[PDB]
Specification:
The chain is 55% helix and 0% strand. The protein is built from four helices and no strands. The chain binds one DNA strand through helix 2. The PDB classes it as transcription, transferase/dna. Keywords: RNA polymerase, Transcription factor, Mycobacterium tuberculosis, Iron cluster, transcription, TRANSFERASE-DNA complex. The entry is titled "Mycobacterium tuberculosis WT RNAP transcription open promoter complex with WhiB7 transcription factor". The protein is RNA polymerase sigma factor SigA.
DNA sequence: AGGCTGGCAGCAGAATAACCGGTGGCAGCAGCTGACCACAACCGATTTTCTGACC
């Protein structure tokens, strides 16, 4: 309990609370188990009717579940420039 | 009897899974307002300046 609770509290930059981390993990497991059986990526309608929620709610959860990229990686593959100098 | 001098050798660094309880936020909305536009009228002189009669 302590390890999983603290991993939810500290694993992310923009902190997501524990209950939304629970529903993100549940949506991930549901999507993986449906993708294995279908042979295809499941639609938001199929995920929403599986998890007993709305497709808008599924889209909001998949919106919240995104990690930031970094400003310091060299997006020029020659290494001369980094990403933080290409932002207006 | 060891020691501290000497190269000698080796190395760091820089550049090019779920429950339960509780508690506070919050948004939605009837329901006092209460200040506020806001038309819309209505008058209070005001000044001009004819209008009308006076002898």
């Amino acid at each position: 309990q302590a390890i999983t609770r603290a991993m939810a509290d500290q694993a992310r930059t923009i902190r997501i609370p524990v209950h939304m981390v629970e529903v993100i993990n549940k949506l991930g497991r549901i999507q993986r188990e449906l993708l294995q059986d279908l042979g295809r990526e499941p639609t938001p309608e199929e995920l929403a009717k599986e998890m007993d929620i709305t497709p808008e709610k599924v889209l909001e959860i998949q919106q919240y579940a995104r990690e930031p990229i970094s400003l310091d990686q060299t997006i020029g593959d020659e290494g001369d420039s980094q990403l933080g100098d290409f932002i207006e």
